[PDB]
Amino acid sequence: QPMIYICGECHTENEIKSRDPIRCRECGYRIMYKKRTKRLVVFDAR
Amino acid sequence: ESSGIVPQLQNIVSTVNLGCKLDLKTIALRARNAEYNPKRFAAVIMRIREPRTTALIFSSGKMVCTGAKSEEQSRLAARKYARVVQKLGFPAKFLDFKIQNMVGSCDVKFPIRLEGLVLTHQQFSSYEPELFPGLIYRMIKPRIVLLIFVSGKVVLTGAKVRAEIYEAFENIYPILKG
Amino acid sequence: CVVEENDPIFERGSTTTYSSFRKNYYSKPWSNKETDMFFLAISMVGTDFSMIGQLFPHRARIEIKNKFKREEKTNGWRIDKAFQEKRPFDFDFFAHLLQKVLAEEEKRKQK
Amino acid sequence: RCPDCGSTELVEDSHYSQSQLVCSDCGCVVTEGVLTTTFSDEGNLREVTYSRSTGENEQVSRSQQRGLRRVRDLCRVLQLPPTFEDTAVAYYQQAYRHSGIRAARLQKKEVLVGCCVLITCRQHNWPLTMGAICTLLYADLDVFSSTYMQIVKLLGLDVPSLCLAELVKTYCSSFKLFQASPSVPAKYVEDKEKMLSRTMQLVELANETWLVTGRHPLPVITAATFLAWQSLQPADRLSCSLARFCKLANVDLPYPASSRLQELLAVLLRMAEQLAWLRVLRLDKRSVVKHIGDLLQHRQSLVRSAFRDLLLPPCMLKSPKRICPVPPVSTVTGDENISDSEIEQYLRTPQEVRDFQRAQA
Amino acid sequence: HECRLRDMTYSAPITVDIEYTRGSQRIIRNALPIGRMPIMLRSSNCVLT
Amino acid sequence: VMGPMLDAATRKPIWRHEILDADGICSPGEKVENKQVLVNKSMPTVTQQPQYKDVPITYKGATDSYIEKVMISSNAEDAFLIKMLLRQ
Amino acid sequence: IVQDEILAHRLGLIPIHADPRLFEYRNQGDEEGTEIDTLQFRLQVRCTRN
Ligand SMILES: [Zn+2]
Ligand SMILES: [Zn+2]
């Protein structure tokens, strides 16, 4: 299963598997965020 | 589906006991090709006209014949050494002769990825290019330690009979080919 | 106190260093006449390296052993012929030949 | 199981800050209430380690303690994390369990410290050169390698291979061509990221072209970074030499680095011949440095074609017509011996005996 | 900010040049780390200034 | 980090592991209720086969919270630090 | 960057020009909504460089 993440400075979609050194291509920044979910979320305007 | 290549034995090592005490001083004094230095080493080095042979004779009768190319050649060399010791004036005998180790060499005639080989057989191999250029493999069905080079040459050691080295090479050939 | 007896060395970079594995041996090669007289000494004595090193002051016993092993591994017929031929041990003429070899190497260094 | 209905549907459901293992079928409370500590209770419980509570650290000799302290000192000097320190001390204790290493030489145990540190460093994919290990360990490479082989054969621990890229990055960080220092002018100063990427591409090319296999990796790394530094500005660095670069960078020049550089330049010349415009230009080992970057753009097909038209030592590529000549089998054994003439010619004559006695008197 | 995110310390490597005598031969070192000093934000050596 | 324990009856994650993603880490944008796990962490008990026991990071809260971001960093000790930013 | 709850609150504060007399109150529950008592407004904006 392709797990995708986002770099802290490049903001590029990088695919890495489990037990890998957290890194991003064309850079060396070590902050990797997770993309927002695709599931439907219901919010109340109250 | 044989490999088609046969190794060549370059050394045969065998220990043999004479069964009697020896006087290394007189042995070295009454011989021309005798090499012995008690302060340096306690064995007399005997060399003969066999194709290649070195005997490390000791005072307890134990002597190790090395450098031979076959078991029969090693036995002939050991018997010649025993005859020389007898002619030197000692009751030497030829008892307890058994092949202790044999070193052989072979070539596969194609390059081998040492990193791939160690990654595939780490539990049976060791690769440290910073120390020795050859990969050291230790197999059990062969009962043999092997030095494998990138050029395709493999040196095998730690066997007792030529059949062991032969089956060792036959088993390791497909692994290196694959 | 050290009165400017030594000079500071700008070595041992704090970053990293590598290995050498080869320190001291650094042997010196032989020559044709030296090989001939070495074979003569072999025929005169045998394989005992102690006497050979004693009679060879300018060459090390370890180098002599290495040369003998190389000859045994490469030129076996020469060793067989050397063992076949025999010569009684000579001391005065051997010292004269040693002096001749010293003169020859001096001339080589001059060249 | 449930004491009432016998069902095994026991679920731990906390009901308003009340941990309770309750059956999911009938709701029968099996167990309820858990005994925790409180903060003042937690503060007044003192932290005592297993090293003291279990009973160890007392059946240890002064030699083992000195070895452990040396391991810790070297780990702190190298600035390795406490996890590395713990792994190193654990491996040192495991090696000390054996008697052969226990009753060994002082140099033997020093090299044992070094090899345990090296194994701990390798187990986490961390690059550390054995040369610096020996330099900081007060030992020689020969005995170091001998004891390393002995201990690895005695133990049989996993020995991960030294990754090339990590060592490349570690050695590139050593060079001072990143910040303009008083000695090095601004012309020699080059970009860090681009030069590191170029060196990584060059060392990957060397690894794929059978240049690092069998040979020391560090000379190849030095040759690759030198070629990268020259290619980033071929104009001002056409006259600079390997020794000059090593002197400028304050780095000990490896001996085979020159040979690795020559072989890599030959490979680059082959790649240029494979390319069209370069093969028309007819470059050489001195003018291909400006097009090395272009060689690395599509090096895949170039190396493929180069292998189509194996890298082996120069001593083997000299037209080996008779590979491993078959020796004549000579199994002539006679009956049991030959004669006594050889025995007599081996025996020393009285004249030679007296001459030897006079010489060695 | 990266230090805050990664739960590490924002410090600089303390280096020194020293000279000693190993075997009565003076050996000098131009740069050797000895510690790490936590750098205050917006200081002279801070990256924010 | 273990993946979401899917229920074989409905082929969907259980109510506790509902907010977890494919990698076992809760994804941003969803709502977190009381007694729900955020990271399905499992650690070995030995320190021959390793025996992992689960120690998930449950969310203790009276009201619901929404995950804004999930940062994953790696320290020098090969340790993965995961920080989830809950908003109310 | 704006929070989801703040965005929902701002959208709720936006008036609708629909005539309320033509609609009815939604019964208790029924989140799916029916044609008589619901109105759907889609908002899809993707910002990109010019
Ligand atoms: Zn990035
Ligand atoms: Zn029940």
CB D305 within 8 A of CB D297: no
Q: How many residues does chain D have?
A: 361
The Cα B162–Cα B104 span in angstroms is 9
C86: DSSP letter:
-
CB E19 within 8 A of CB E26: yes
Q: Report H helices in chain D.
A: 39-44, 50-53, 62-77, 82-96, 99-102, 106-123, 130-137, 141-155, 164-174, 192-208, 217-231, 242-249, 257-274, 276-281, 292-295, 299-308, 341-346, 350-359
Q: For chain B, what is the domain count?
A: 2
CB D333 within 8 A of CB B76: yes
- Checking phi first, is residue B61 left (phi over 0); if not, alpha (psi -120 to 50) or beta? left
CB D252 within 8 A of CB C18: yes
Instruction: Give me ligand 2 centre to Cα D31, in Å.
Output: 12
Residues of chain C in contact with residue E26, where contact means CB-CB under 8 angstroms, are: 2, 6-9
Residues in chain E whose Cβ is within 8 Å of chain F = 5-8
The range of the structural domain enclosing residue B50 comes to: 14-99
Q: List own/partner pairs for D153-156 with CB under 8 A and 24 or more apart.
A: D154/D95, D154/D98, D154/D100, D154/D101, D155/D94, D155/D95, D155/D98
Q: How far is A10 from chain E (nearest CA, A)?
A: 15
Token output for A9: 């400075």
Instruction: Give me ligand 2 centre to Cα D27, in Å.
Output: 6
CB D224 within 8 A of CB D289: no
Whether B135 and B82 share a structural domain: no
Q: How far is E6 from chain F (nearest CA, A)?
A: 6
**Touch test E–C: 3 Cβ pairs or more under 8 Å:** yes
- Checking phi first, is residue D319 left (phi over 0); if not, alpha (psi -120 to 50) or beta? left
The Cα G4–Cα A44 span in angstroms is 10
* Secondary element (H or E) of residue C94: helix C92-110
Residues of chain D in contact with residue B111, where contact means CB-CB under 8 angstroms, are: 210, 310, 312
Token output for B173: 């050939």
CB F2 within 8 A of CB F24: yes
Cα dist from F88 to A25, B178, F32, F37, G8, whole Å: 35, 60, 10, 17, 14
Which of A 5-44 lie inside 8 A of E, CB atoms?
Answer: 30-31
CATH of the domain at B21: 3.30.310.10
F3: DSSP letter:
P
Cα dist from B164 to B66, B102, B138, D283, whole Å: 19, 10, 14, 54
Touching D: which chains, 3+ CB pairs < 8 A? B, C, F
Q: How many residues does chain E have?
A: 49
* CA-based nearest residue to B178, from B134, B121, B130: B121
- Checking phi first, is residue D33 left (phi over 0); if not, alpha (psi -120 to 50) or beta? left
Please tell me which residue of chain F has the smallest CA distance to D12.
F35
- In angstroms, the first-to-last Cα distance of chain F is 26
Please tell me which residue of chain E has the smallest CA distance to C12.
E29
The Cα D291–Cα D275 span in angstroms is 11
CB D175 within 8 A of CB D249: yes
Token output for F21: 């993603």
Whether B88 and B142 share a structural domain: no
The Cα E35–Cα D100 span in angstroms is 38
D314: DSSP letter:
T
Q: Please give the biggest Cα pair distance in chain C.
A: 66
Cα dist from D20 to B144, F60, F62, whole Å: 62, 16, 18
Spatial neighbors of B147 by CB under 8 A, at least 6 apart, are B132, B134, B135, B136, B154, B155
Q: Is F83 on the interface with E (CB under 8 A)?
A: yes
Residues of chain D in contact with residue C88, where contact means CB-CB under 8 angstroms, are: 351-352, 355
Please tell me which residue of chain B has the smallest CA distance to D334.
B76
Question: Looking at this protein, which amino acid is placed at residue C60?
Answer: A
The Cα D337–Cα B42 span in angstroms is 28
Sign of the Cα torsion D107, D110, D112, D114 reads: negative
The Cα B29–Cα D145 span in angstroms is 40
CB A32 within 8 A of CB F71: yes
Whether B18 and B88 share a structural domain: yes
* Secondary element (H or E) of residue C110: helix C92-110
Whether B132 and B119 share a structural domain: yes
The Cα C37–Cα C52 span in angstroms is 11
Name F37's bridge partners. Answer: F58
| Residue B165: CB atoms within 10 Å | 25
B152: DSSP letter:
S
Q: List own/partner pairs for D316-324 with CB under 8 A and 24 or more apart.
A: D316/B151, D323/B107, D323/B109, D324/B8, D324/B105, D324/B107
Residues D216-242: b if buried by 16+ CB within 10 A, e if exposed: bbbbbbbbbbbbbbbbbebeebeeeee
The Cα E31–Cα F76 span in angstroms is 24
The Cα F60–Cα D96 span in angstroms is 48
Spatial neighbors of B81 by CB under 8 A, at least 6 apart, are B46, B48, B55, B57, B63, B65
The Cα D288–Cα D277 span in angstroms is 12
Please report, to the nearest 10 degrees, the dihedral formed by the alpha carbons of residues D188, D191, D195, D197 taken in order: 180
* CA-based nearest residue to D194, from D147, D146, D148, D229: D229
> Which numbered ligand comes closest to the C-alpha of D26?
2
- Checking phi first, is residue B151 left (phi over 0); if not, alpha (psi -120 to 50) or beta? alpha
Token pair 């650290």 in the structure block, residue: D57
The Cα D144–Cα D136 span in angstroms is 12
Spatial neighbors of D28 by CB under 8 A, at least 6 apart, are D2, D3, D4, D5, D22
* CA-based nearest residue to B76, from B101, B45, B55: B55
Please tell me which residue of chain C has the smallest CA distance to B49.
C80
Residue E17, class by beta-carbon neighbours within 10 Å (0-12 exposed, 13-18 middle, 19+ buried)? exposed
The Cα E5–Cα F72 span in angstroms is 9
Which of C5, C14, C17 to substitute to test the interface with E, most E CBs within 10 Å?
C14
CB D113 within 8 A of CB D70: yes
> Which numbered ligand comes closest to the C-alpha of D29?
2
Read out DSSP for G13-48? TS---S-GGGS-PPPSS-TT--GGG-----------
Residues of chain D in contact with residue F35, where contact means CB-CB under 8 angstroms, are: 13-14
Token pair 């070629």 in the structure block, residue: D227
Token pair 């850079």 in the structure block, residue: A27
Name B95's bridge partners. Answer: B17
CA Rg value for chain A: 14
Residue B67, class by beta-carbon neighbours within 10 Å (0-12 exposed, 13-18 middle, 19+ buried)? buried
Instruction: Give me ligand 2 centre to Cα D9, in Å.
Output: 7
Name E12's bridge partners. Answer: E37
At residue B13, φ and ψ (nearest 5 deg) are -110, 130
Name A4's bridge partners. Answer: A15
Cβ separation of D81 and F76 shorter than 8 Å?
Answer: yes
CATH of the domain at A33: 2.20.28.30
The Cα D314–Cα B151 span in angstroms is 11
Whether B105 and B90 share a structural domain: no
Residue C5, class by beta-carbon neighbours within 10 Å (0-12 exposed, 13-18 middle, 19+ buried)? exposed
Cα dist from C2 to B35, C9, D332, E30, whole Å: 52, 16, 74, 22
The Cα G1–Cα D34 span in angstroms is 43
Cα dist from A45 to B62, D26, D300, G29, whole Å: 99, 40, 58, 16
Spatial neighbors of B10 by CB under 8 A, at least 6 apart, are B69, B103, B104, B105
Question: Looking at this protein, which amino acid is placed at residue D338?
Answer: I
A7: DSSP letter:
E
Please report, to the nearest 10 degrees, the dihedral formed by the alpha carbons of residues D147, D152, D158, D164 taken in order: 40
> Number of C-alpha atoms within 13 angstroms, CB side, residue A29?
18
- Checking phi first, is residue B67 left (phi over 0); if not, alpha (psi -120 to 50) or beta? left
CB F37 within 8 A of CB F56: yes
Spatial neighbors of B97 by CB under 8 A, at least 6 apart, are B14, B16, B75, B78
* Secondary element (H or E) of residue F23: none
Token output for F18: 């509902």
| Residue D276: CB atoms within 10 Å | 9
Q: Is C10 on the interface with E (CB under 8 A)?
A: yes
Spatial neighbors of B9 by CB under 8 A, at least 6 apart, are B69, B70, B102, B103, B104, B162, B165
Q: For chain A, what is the domain count?
A: 1
SS3 assignment, position B174: helix
The Cα D151–Cα D160 span in angstroms is 16
Token output for B72: 């029969």
CB D151 within 8 A of CB D115: yes
Whether B82 and B127 share a structural domain: no
Cβ separation of A32 and F71 shorter than 8 Å?
Answer: yes
Could you list the residues of A known to form a binding site, using ranges: 7, 10, 24, 27
Spatial neighbors of D334 by CB under 8 A, at least 6 apart, are none
Residues D122-146: b if buried by 16+ CB within 10 A, e if exposed: bbeebbbbbbebbbbbebbbeebbe
Q: How was this structure determined?
A: cryo-EM
The Cα B5–Cα B25 span in angstroms is 47
Name D36's bridge partners. Answer: none
| Residue B177: CB atoms within 10 Å | 10
May I ask the CATH architecture of the domain D54-155? Orthogonal Bundle (1.10)
Whether B74 and B120 share a structural domain: no
CB D94 within 8 A of CB D112: no
The Cα B28–Cα B5 span in angstroms is 44
CB A14 within 8 A of CB A25: yes
* CA-based nearest residue to D220, from D245, D197, D200, D239: D200
Sign of the Cα torsion C23, C24, C28, C34 reads: negative
Which of G4, G6, G7, G9 to substitute to test the interface with F, most F CBs within 10 Å?
G4
Whether B111 and B149 share a structural domain: yes
Residues of chain D in contact with residue B107, where contact means CB-CB under 8 angstroms, are: 323-324
Given B99, B122, B141, the domain boundary residue is: B99
CB D209 within 8 A of CB D224: no
Question: Looking at this protein, which amino acid is placed at residue D274?
Answer: Q
Token output for D345: 């010619």
